[PDB]
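Tokens for chain A. Residues wanted.
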């Protein structure tokens, strides 16, 4: 849906790595110099499992995806990745959902497009499928990929 963050930088945060206990990340990790997709997901989200296989496909094509596990059960989340594959370059654990609150998410799943400079450029509330990618996000990803280059 619509977002008041379009054109604004990613909110400050300090979250623990989902699969690397003790390692914490900050917003600087979302300023890669290349565009990135931030995917909000959880194991309790039905369309998330279905969307996971498509994310694996995009990741294999070079699309950079950062995963934000939302108000979820950490262990179940880790098993989820070991069982279905890990498309994420990095996985953040938003156990309390505080980053989700600053991002204005309605729930899961949701995908944000962030440019190389850490500026939020698009927000899609709902599952990521070929149609959404081809019609809504792909054109934007290509634009910011060419500029970052």
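Reply:
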């Amino acid at each position: 849906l619509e977002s008041a963050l379009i054109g604004k930088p990613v909110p400050k945060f300090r979250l623990e790595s989902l699969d690397n206990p003790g390692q914490f990340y900050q917003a600087d990790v979302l300023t890669q110099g290349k565009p990135v997709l931030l995917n909000v997901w959880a194991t309790w989200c039905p369309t998330c499992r279905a969307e996971h296989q498509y994310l694996n496909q995009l990741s294999a094509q070079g699309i950079r995806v950062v995963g934000m596990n939302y108000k979820d059960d950490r262990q179940k989340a880790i098993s989820w990745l070991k069982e279905l594959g890990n498309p994420y370059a990095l996985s953040l654990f938003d156990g309390d959902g505080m980053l989700g609150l600053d991002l204005g998410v309605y729930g899961a799943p949701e995908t944000f497009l962030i440019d190389g400079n850490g500026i939020i450029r698009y927000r899609h509330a709902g599952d990521l499928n070929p149609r959404v990618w081809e019609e809504e996000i792909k054109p934007l990803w290509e634009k910011y990929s060419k500029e970052a280059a």
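The radius of gyration is 14 Å. The helical segments are 46-60, 74-84, 98-103, 130-148.
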